[PDB]
RNA sequence: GUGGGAGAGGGUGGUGGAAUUCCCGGAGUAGCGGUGAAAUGCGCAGAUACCGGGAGGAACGCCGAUGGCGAAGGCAGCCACCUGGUCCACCCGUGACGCUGAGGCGCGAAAGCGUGGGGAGCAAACCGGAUUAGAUACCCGGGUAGUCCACGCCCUAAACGAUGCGCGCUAGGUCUCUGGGUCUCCUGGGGGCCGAAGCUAACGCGUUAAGCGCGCCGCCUGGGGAGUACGGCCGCAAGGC
């Protein structure tokens, strides 16, 4: 298995039942691909520097996961199929390379 | 008038999610800045870049901007 | 990939004595393992020309190590070839 | 008839001519102008003098619509892209921002033989 | 073998913004374009300029370098997967297992060929406008093959460092990319510029030899005729050796 980080930018205008239904669905199809969730971040409402889908803002999720590599591209095709989800970016985890230190 | 990493603390070059710091290395327009302005090393700047381009696709950073005065 | 302990299984299998890492046996076995992987790579991906050159290289090396090993100790050579299914 | 108050001025300046379109805060043009709009016909279209006259034209025409404050956007480069904003500066329209927006591509299209 | 690294090395699938073209819509008039100057062209069926929405292709600004990777050809958005080569440190394992390489086999820019897609910009042929003594060209307005993708052929080049591969030796200096160190500096491994000895017809080369040596392969032996002719082999052909 490898360490990945999933980013999610979805509709900023979502009401509660809605938004935590998208969250429920993401998580559902995370465990569905054999991914184990390590840690989570929600930065939430944030101001994009250019409009994404006609919309000046976006809602921000960050997950750290570990999972089967042979899947991770399917994992992505899946997170993307969802309608309200504007970006999905999955990265490999890397060490913190600094400077000025 | 001197360089960027001059004004900054120990900070992560590989964290694409940090806009507060990363906006600093962009120019007036979104243009990633020259080394001579960022004061980085080769490996440094080369990492900074790819980290920006990521942030950009995530929507956090400008692909481009508009010029004021002129 | 080849994760480190796949590597290990092959080595700590193929050594003349414990601790031997680089003897001809172990070399040819590591070679072989890597070769078979690359062969299975280019069963798809026929258009990967550069990796293929790599394979040529790997290959030619194995044959050289065998060629030696035969010239030295035929008993152990036939041991090897039988154990790996080659030449 | 509009009564448009504050508005947006666009200077598009190529090597061959200048032209100025004037719009409203949400971007819909009101009047426009160019070197050919006024007398000028050939090459002397892309002089600066005409860039002057063009700007001026467009802004007199806008005076007629009830304009005061005007924010400028500018696209292109060619002689009297500047002269345009100078003319249009002392026009009687108070100029609020000036901005250069010239489109540049991140490299899509092969250009024409004269352009590479 | 173990540990650590850099990279546009390759192949596969995703994806992002900028720009162009087009289509729909709002608003707005008389021109836009174009050049030395013009005209053809487009525009009252409403263009150009401006704002919003969609479609589609191709290429990835800044970072970018006098940089990096690759045997060469060549390789630049971001992500993931599959994979090649390589560098340093440790001095642990085998124990001469080495070098070169006629033939063969494989790769091989661009254009070109076949079959099927795709086609925005560009653009051989071509159609026009100019210029000129004429213009069959430069310059302007169009435009088809093609450029793109898949699969299969073609095998050429200023395929250039015009410098075959490997190893050993022979002052340094300066800039640099990337490793390890007791981190001003030292030490490996790439890229450059000056220069010892030396070489060279000269230009120049000079620890990235064109120096001093050894091994092995390719090749040369006036110009024109001529990369022609004849024969053979390859190729659907073009044409190649
Ligand atoms: Mg979606
Ligand atoms: Mg003109
Ligand atoms: Mg690459
Ligand atoms: Mg690649
Ligand atoms: Mg792509
Ligand atoms: Mg577009
Ligand atoms: Mg319309
Ligand atoms: Mg007319
Ligand atoms: Mg008409
Ligand atoms: Mg008409
Ligand atoms: Mg539009
Ligand atoms: Mg179309
Ligand atoms: Mg550049
Ligand atoms: Mg690798
Ligand atoms: Mg030893
Ligand atoms: Mg020993
Ligand atoms: Mg011994
Ligand atoms: Mg060889
Ligand atoms: Mg070829
Ligand atoms: Mg071709
Ligand atoms: Mg074809
Ligand atoms: Mg054209
Ligand atoms: Mg003609
Ligand atoms: Mg033309
Ligand atoms: Mg030659
Ligand atoms: Mg020689
Ligand atoms: Mg190299
Ligand atoms: Mg050096
Ligand atoms: Mg040097
Ligand atoms: Mg020199
Ligand atoms: Mg001398
Ligand atoms: Mg030498
Ligand atoms: Mg003769
Ligand atoms: Mg020939
Ligand atoms: Mg004969
Ligand atoms: Mg013949
Ligand atoms: Mg020929």
Short mmCIF file of N, CA and C (backbone and C1' of nucleotides) in Angstrom, two decimals, chain A residues 2 4 50 54 72-73 77 80 87 90-92, chain E residues 13-17 53-54 78-82:
data_model
loop_
_atom_site.label_atom_id
_atom_site.label_comp_id
_atom_site.label_asym_id
_atom_site.label_seq_id
_atom_site.Cartn_x
_atom_site.Cartn_y
_atom_site.Cartn_z
N UNK A 2 0.29 2.38 -0.41
CA UNK A 2 1.02 3.64 -0.42
C UNK A 2 0.20 4.76 0.24
N UNK A 4 -1.43 8.27 0.13
CA UNK A 4 -1.97 9.25 -0.78
C UNK A 4 -2.71 10.35 -0.03
N UNK A 50 -9.69 31.95 -9.38
CA UNK A 50 -10.42 32.05 -10.63
C UNK A 50 -11.67 31.19 -10.43
N UNK A 54 -18.29 28.59 -12.83
CA UNK A 54 -19.11 29.80 -12.83
C UNK A 54 -19.22 30.40 -11.43
N UNK A 72 -6.18 3.28 -7.36
CA UNK A 72 -6.27 4.73 -7.10
C UNK A 72 -6.76 5.58 -8.27
N UNK A 73 -6.51 5.11 -9.48
CA UNK A 73 -7.10 5.74 -10.64
C UNK A 73 -8.61 5.42 -10.74
N UNK A 77 -11.70 8.08 -10.81
CA UNK A 77 -12.85 8.09 -11.75
C UNK A 77 -14.17 8.13 -11.01
N UNK A 80 -15.02 11.45 -9.04
CA UNK A 80 -15.35 12.42 -10.08
C UNK A 80 -16.77 12.24 -10.57
N UNK A 87 -13.54 19.54 -8.21
CA UNK A 87 -12.20 19.02 -8.48
C UNK A 87 -11.95 17.88 -7.56
N UNK A 90 -5.81 13.63 -6.41
CA UNK A 90 -5.16 12.71 -5.50
C UNK A 90 -3.69 12.69 -5.77
N UNK A 91 -2.91 12.85 -4.71
CA UNK A 91 -1.46 12.93 -4.80
C UNK A 91 -0.76 11.82 -3.99
N UNK A 92 0.49 11.50 -4.32
CA UNK A 92 1.24 10.65 -3.41
C UNK A 92 1.76 11.55 -2.30
P G E 13 -4.24 5.35 -23.65
"O5'" G E 13 -5.07 5.85 -22.39
"C5'" G E 13 -6.11 5.04 -21.86
"C4'" G E 13 -6.43 5.38 -20.42
"C3'" G E 13 -6.98 6.78 -20.17
"O3'" G E 13 -8.37 6.89 -20.45
"C1'" G E 13 -5.27 6.30 -18.61
P G E 14 -8.98 8.29 -20.97
"O5'" G E 14 -8.66 9.29 -19.76
"C5'" G E 14 -9.69 9.72 -18.87
"C4'" G E 14 -9.17 10.07 -17.49
"C3'" G E 14 -9.26 11.53 -17.10
"O3'" G E 14 -10.55 11.90 -16.66
"C1'" G E 14 -7.12 10.70 -16.52
P U E 15 -11.36 13.01 -17.48
"O5'" U E 15 -10.59 14.35 -17.08
"C5'" U E 15 -10.65 14.85 -15.75
"C4'" U E 15 -9.43 15.66 -15.38
"C3'" U E 15 -9.40 17.09 -15.88
"O3'" U E 15 -10.04 17.98 -15.01
"C1'" U E 15 -7.29 16.02 -16.18
P G E 16 -10.87 19.21 -15.60
"O5'" G E 16 -9.83 20.39 -15.54
"C5'" G E 16 -9.25 20.78 -14.31
"C4'" G E 16 -8.24 21.85 -14.53
"C3'" G E 16 -8.64 22.95 -15.51
"O3'" G E 16 -9.39 23.99 -14.88
"C1'" G E 16 -6.49 22.13 -16.07
P G E 17 -10.50 24.83 -15.71
"O5'" G E 17 -9.63 26.01 -16.34
"C5'" G E 17 -9.13 27.07 -15.53
"C4'" G E 17 -7.88 27.69 -16.14
"C3'" G E 17 -8.05 28.43 -17.45
"O3'" G E 17 -8.53 29.75 -17.31
"C1'" G E 17 -6.22 26.99 -17.63
P G E 53 -19.82 32.69 -18.59
"O5'" G E 53 -20.74 31.85 -19.58
"C5'" G E 53 -21.91 31.20 -19.10
"C4'" G E 53 -22.67 30.50 -20.20
"C3'" G E 53 -21.98 29.35 -20.91
"O3'" G E 53 -21.91 28.17 -20.14
"C1'" G E 53 -23.04 30.69 -22.51
P G E 54 -20.62 27.22 -20.24
"O5'" G E 54 -20.80 26.50 -21.65
"C5'" G E 54 -21.79 25.50 -21.83
"C4'" G E 54 -22.03 25.19 -23.29
"C3'" G E 54 -20.97 24.37 -23.99
"O3'" G E 54 -21.04 23.00 -23.68
"C1'" G E 54 -21.67 26.15 -25.40
P C E 78 4.24 19.75 -15.18
"O5'" C E 78 3.01 19.38 -14.24
"C5'" C E 78 2.53 20.29 -13.27
"C4'" C E 78 1.22 19.83 -12.73
"C3'" C E 78 1.17 18.38 -12.31
"O3'" C E 78 1.70 18.16 -11.03
"C1'" C E 78 -0.68 18.84 -13.66
P C E 79 2.31 16.74 -10.65
"O5'" C E 79 1.05 15.80 -10.68
"C5'" C E 79 0.06 15.91 -9.68
"C4'" C E 79 -0.96 14.82 -9.83
"C3'" C E 79 -0.42 13.41 -9.86
"O3'" C E 79 -0.03 12.92 -8.59
"C1'" C E 79 -2.06 13.67 -11.54
P A E 80 1.17 11.88 -8.47
"O5'" A E 80 0.45 10.49 -8.78
"C5'" A E 80 -0.79 10.17 -8.19
"C4'" A E 80 -1.42 9.00 -8.89
"C3'" A E 80 -0.48 7.84 -9.23
"O3'" A E 80 -0.22 6.98 -8.15
"C1'" A E 80 -1.74 8.38 -11.13
P C E 81 1.15 6.18 -8.14
"O5'" C E 81 0.93 5.13 -9.29
"C5'" C E 81 0.20 3.96 -9.05
"C4'" C E 81 -0.19 3.30 -10.33
"C3'" C E 81 0.89 2.50 -11.03
"O3'" C E 81 1.09 1.22 -10.45
"C1'" C E 81 -0.18 3.88 -12.59
P C E 82 2.58 0.69 -10.15
"O5'" C E 82 3.06 0.24 -11.60
"C5'" C E 82 2.26 -0.67 -12.33
"C4'" C E 82 2.81 -0.92 -13.71
"C3'" C E 82 4.32 -1.02 -13.83
"O3'" C E 82 4.83 -2.27 -13.44
"C1'" C E 82 3.51 0.41 -15.49
#
